[PDB]
Structure formats: structure tokens, C-alpha cells
Design a protein around this ligand. Structure first.
Ligand code: ATP
Length: 598
């Protein structure tokens, strides 16, 4: 009939959207489809990919590896994708180097990441030939801020490296199969390659899942990180043919970075190269003295380390990138970061090689069907952009009861705030039927709350820190809930946007799910986005960009609560006093909160 391959499995609520996304994508449009989390988007993605595939169209589905299992188990069973084929391209940028990442972990006191690497890089989240270990995505879960670019599995990492072996084994299975599953990072790396294993040079149909993340994947691909302690470690044992000049050039670079950071008004701002000319000598000489090192005789790892250092220095010298210094007075691990504030050329080079696309996420619209700022982040041409009506069923908000209690003190980052916020949080934790997730915006607030909250909650309380990551806190939260205690999670970062608080001991019983019963927003997440592209976007567009980004960081934070239909007795507290003030700048947020009733 008229139905697409796999529409029967697709949820009825998603059937209209699907159909729309089928037509425009066939036309050539880049479609913005937003359905609420828990609506069975994977079945829709499988149906779209199949409907494009049987026409002879080469189809690429770019999704995070953490949901690729669900996508393949939605795709494999339908006849059409079996007819055309379903392969999965695991390029090297999908894998970290265990040796260098362990090196980074011991230097940065990352106990959990080190333990993970020592255990074999086993997946944190449970067609696929071997078990996927050494994934960059899992390491990101264990360390939000790890320098992925200097830790990725390079092409010249030794053959005995477990990540290299696993990559080669997975490569031995890659066949051109019509439907190709890849990651966001792989997509961005391939686009960067083309702008200068691989995907088709032209993608007839591109389904991006969790598209709200794609931009980050591109940013990480155009980042470059110069880390000095491992570089010096490598140089000192490398040889004597050009060693001492390289060591002293690195020391000169370190001192110049120290001077530049000392002179800065604050260390967070990403200054351009012209703003800090002291680096121009050092970098250049560094580059030169990193080219004065003989290749033959070098260990397989030292080659990649030196080459990546040269790449980072050349990116910092190109003048097209914004730099960031972190040095000894503040940061023990000396780092020079270099990123692109404008990803327009690469994202264009992506969409120009795309016959049609469907971007799928639970958060693609600032308000209603407004995909303007998402369209700006992904640099979708306005000609091809097509926003479809969002799909947010009533079960996303009906179970949850919005609590009117709040902390009157404004979020001033002060102990005066902290004690009263802790008092209201204590009242919340007394009544919690299950887990409690207290979302904070800064580590300062997290540790401040932990100070005034640790005694009463005792073993319940779970702090998130640089030392204790979001994934480790998730594991502890689930384990504590299984044990009958009612944990409270002072979470931040990935807790806002990247954790699924669904009881997996209750898959077919959503009504009994109490893994997260009370979600508590301490304050509005204004200015949480730190991307270079966000700096540029805010500069160009004013405070509206800040308000919009904060609004959907807020939306994802609330999306922590309800994950599937059937849940009940969910409680939502938002303790930010500015919400209940009369200010107009909170009017978007109140709008969101107005969907939650009583
Ligand atoms: N029509 C349906 N009826 C019942 N269960 C369904 C239906 N469609 C999907 N499901 C199941 O519901 C669960 C939720 O699916 P999924 O995780 O893909 O949802 P999502 O949050 O919308 O999407 P994604 O994780 O891809 O962004 C899955 O186990 C899926 O198999």
C-alpha cells in the first residue's frame, strides 16, 4: 500500500511525522523532526532509512553508539533493509588510545577513567562482530572534558594496541551495504576529510539521530589540544638528535603561556591568536623543533604523539582559531586548546553532499516549531530547512506534579543561598519515594550543597565532581536505589542532558518505576553552553541566543524526569527564586513550566 517499510512497528503517535519526514527528505529538504523521548523514534528512523533505501538511495544513519544497538534492533527485522543490507562503519575516531588515555588519567587524577582503561575499556552501556571497547563515547561519559583529539586512536598507533586490533577486526567486516550506520564523530571526521575507513562521498539520504549533539561532534573534530607534560615525557626518552632544543622550546612555550594567562583578566575567555602574540615565537619554534626529530627509530607511540603535537601547534598558528591557556597557577596539567568559532564551511560541505536529511531529537526547537537556532548551529541552508510540528504527547507531563515550594534566596553562589537551598532539598529528600536528582550548574554549588547536606543524608548522598564523574554517579545511583536507600544525586553537566534515569529492572512495568521520583532544579541553567560557536552566536544575536540556549538546557533537564509512557508519581521542584519573580527574561522558562500542571 502507501505505507513505508516498517511503518507497522512505528508508534501511531509518530506516524504522521514519519510520513511528513518521508516526503520532504525525498524532495531534498533537511527535515527537523522533534518527538518527545520515549515515543519510539528508533522505529521511525528505521522506517525512514528503509523507505529511502529500497529506492537505490545510499543511506547513512549517524547516531551516537550508545543508541546504535537499539537502532540496529529496530532495523534488522524488516525485510527491506535485509534486501539492501545494513553495515556499520567504525572508523578510528570512534576509538581512544588506551595507553595515552590511561596516561592522561594518572596525570589528571581520573581514578574512574583509569580503572575503566585498565579493565579493558568495557562498554558502560549494554551485525556487530566483536564487543565494542575503547569507545571515545564511554571515555567522554567517564571524563566530560577529556581532550579527545590527542587521545583518539591514530592511524600509526601500534598494531599490538587493543584498540588498534579491535578497529582492524571491525574493519575486516565493513562492506558497502546500502544502509550505513556511523557515529556523529565519524560523520564530522569524514566531513573534515572531504573539506581537505570512510563514508560515501555523496549521501543520498542522511538520518541524524540525537541531532542536538551533532554540532558538538563537529566542534571536537576541529579542536586541537597541546598537552605539555606527556609531550616532554616523550621527548626526554626519544633520543638525542634534536632533543634538548625541543625540551627548551617546550619550556619557553610553557613560560609564555604562563605569562599570557597571568596577564588575562580571566582565564576562561577564548582569546584569538592575535590577542596573545607572545605565543607566536614559541609555537613557531616549537613546530620547527618538532620537525627536527628523526622518524626512523621512534617508538610507534612517540610518532603519533609528536605528529599530534605538531598538528595542534599548527592549528594554533593558523590564525583561524581561538586559543585557551590553562597553566600551573590554576591547572596542574598544562594545556593549550585551539578551536574553531565558525563551523560554517564544514557543515556546508556536509549538507552539499546530502540529497536529503532528517534530523531527529527530543530537543530541536527553541519554542513550538521554531528550529531557527538549531538551523543556525547546524548551518542548514534556509532553502532546504523544513520544520515539522513537534510530537510531545500528554504522558510526558501528566504523571509529574509540579511543586510550588521554592528557595526564596536567589542563586548567588553564596553560603547564605546554600543553606536555604539545602533546607528545601532536605524537605524534598524527606518525602522522596525513590531517587532524587538535584541538578546544579557549577561544581561550586555542588560542593557547597554537599557541605551543608552530607550529614543528614549520609550514605544516600552522591556528589558529582571532577573526581567522581556523571557515569560513576549514575552507577552509584542505580546501585543505591537497588539497595532500598533513596539516593540524592547532586548532579551537573551530563546529568542535565545525558543520563537515562529509567529502572532497567522494571522494563515492562513503567508504573512501578521509582528510580527517579523527585527532580529538583536548583537554578536556571543560564550560560551553561561554553562552545566557541555559542560565543560567536551570542555575540552576533544578543541575549536572545543566551536565553534560548538556557531554555532548552532547561528543557533537557526537565526531560531527565519522564522517559517513557506509564510512569507515575513523578515530582518536579524548581527552586530558582528568579522563576517566581516578575522578570520578563524568565518568561520562556515559565512557559515551559506552564505545561506542567498543579
Ligand atoms: N509502537 C510501539 N509500541 C510499543 N513499544 C514501542 C513502540 N515503538 C517503539 N517501542 C519501544 O519503546 C522503547 C523506546 O524506544 P526508543 O528508545 O527508540 O525511544 P526514543 O527516546 O523516542 O528514541 P531514541 O532513543 O532513538 O532517540 C523501545 O524499547 C522501543 O522498542
Amino acid at each position: 500500500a502507501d505505507a513505508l517499510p516498517g511503518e507497522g512497528a512505528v508508534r501511531e503517535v509518530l506516524r504522521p511525522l514519519l510520513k511528513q519526514a518521508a516526503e520532504k527528505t525525498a524532495a531534498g529538504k533537511i527535515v527537523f523532526a522533534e518527538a518527545a523521548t520515549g515515543t519510539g523514534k528508533g522505529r521511525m528512523i528505521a522506517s525512514l532509512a528503509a523507505a529511502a533505501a529500497i529506492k537505490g538511495d545510499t543511506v547513512v544513519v549517524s547516531a551516537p553508539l550508545a543508541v546504535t544497538w537499539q537502532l540496529v534492533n529496530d532495523m534488522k527485522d524488516i525485510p527491506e533493509v535485509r534486501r539492501v543490507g545494513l553495515t556499520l562503519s567504525l572508523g578510528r575516531p570512534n576509538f581512544i588510545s588506551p595507553q595515552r588515555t590511561l596516561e592522561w588519567a594518572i596525570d589528571n587524577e581520573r581514578a574512574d577513567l583509569a580503572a575503566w582503561i585498565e579493565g579493558g575499556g568495557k562498554p558502560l552501556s549494554l551485525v556487530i562482530s566483536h564487543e565494542l571497547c575503547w569507545l571515545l563515547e564511554d571515555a567522554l561519559l567517564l571524563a566530560e572534558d577529556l581532550p579527545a583529539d590527542s587521545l583518539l586512536l591514530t592511524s600509526e598507533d601500534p598494531a599490538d594496541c587493543p584498540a588498534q586490533q579491535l578497529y582492524v577486526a571491525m574493519r575486516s567486516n565493513y562492506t558497502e551495504a546500502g544502509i550505513i550506520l556511523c557515529s556523529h564523530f565519524m560523520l564530522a571526521a569524514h566531513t573534515r576529510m572531504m573539506q581537505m575507513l570512510s563514508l560515501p562521498h555523496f549521501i543520498d539520504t542522511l538520518i541524524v539521530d540525537e541531532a542536538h549533539l551533532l554540532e558538538q561532534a563537529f566542534a571536537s573534530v576541529y579542536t586541537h589540544t597541546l598537552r605539555l607534560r606527556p609531550l616532554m615525557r616523550t621527548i626526554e626518552g626519544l633520543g638525542s638528535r634534536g632533543r634538548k632544543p625541543a625540551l627548551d622550546a617546550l619550556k619557553e612555550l610553557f613560560t609564555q603561556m604562563q605569562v599570557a594567562s597571568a596577564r588575562s583578566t580571566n582565564t576562561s575567555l577564548n582569546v584569538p591568536l592575535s590577542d596573545v602574540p607572545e605565543l607566536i615565537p614559541a609555537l613557531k619554534d616549537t613546530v620547527k623543533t618538532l620537525g627536527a626529530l628523526p622518524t626512523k627509530g621512534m617508538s610507534r607511540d612517540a610518532r603519533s604523539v609528536i605528529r599530534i603535537a605538531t598538528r595542534a601547534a599548527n592549528d594554533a598558528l593558523s590564525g583561524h582559531s581561538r586559543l585557551r591557556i590553562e597553566v600551573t597557577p590554576v591547572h596542574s596539567y598544562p594545556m593549550l586548546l585551539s578551536g574553531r568559532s565558525n563551523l560554517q564551511r564544514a557543515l556546508l560541505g556536509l549538507w552539499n553532499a546530502t540529497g536529503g536529511a532528517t534530523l531527529v531529537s527530543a530537543t530541536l526547537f527553541t519554542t513550538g516549531d521554531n528550529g531557527s537556532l538549531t538551523r543556525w548551529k547546524l548551518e542548514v541552508p534556509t532553502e532546504r530547512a523544513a520544520f515539522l510540528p513537534p510530537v510531545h504527547p500528554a504522558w510526558t507531563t501528566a504523571p509529574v506534579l509540579l511543586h510550588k515550594e521554592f528557595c526564596a534566596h536567589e542563586p548567588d553562589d553564596s553560603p547564605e543561598w546554600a543553606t536555604e537551598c539545602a533546607q528545601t532539598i532536605q524537605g524534598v529528600a524527606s518525602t522522596a519515594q525513590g531517587g532524587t536528582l538535584v541538578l546544579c550548574t557549577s561544581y561550586q554549588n555542588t560542593e557547597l550543597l554537599a557541605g551543608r547536606l552530607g550529614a543528614a543524608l549520609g550514605d544516600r548522598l552522591i556528589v558529582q565532581s571532577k573526581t567522581s564523574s556523571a557515569a560513576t554517579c549514575l552507577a552509584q545511583f542505580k546501585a543505591k536505589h537497588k539497595a532500598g536507600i533513596r539516593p540524592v544525586w547532586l548532579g551537573l553537566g551530563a546529568a542535565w542532558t545525558g543520563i537515562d534515569l529509567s529502572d532497567h529492572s522494571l522494563p515492562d512495568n513503567p508504573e512501578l518505576d521509582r528510580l527517579l521520583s523527585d527532580l529538583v532544579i536548583t537554578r536556571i541553567p543560564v550560560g551553561q553552553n561554553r562552545s566557541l560557536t555559542h560565543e560567536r552566536r551570542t555575540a552576533i544575536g544578543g541575549f536572545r541566543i543566551i536565553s534560548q540556549e538556557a531554555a532548552w538546557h532547561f528543557r533537557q533537564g526537565l526531560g531527565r524526569l519522564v522517559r517513557r509512557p506509564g510512569v507515575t508519581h513523578k515530582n518536579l521542584w524548581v527552586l530558582d527564586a528568579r522563576i517566581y519573580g516578575g522578570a520578563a527574561w524568565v518568561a520562556p522558562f515559565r512557559q515551559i513550566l506552564d505545561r506542567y500542571k498543579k
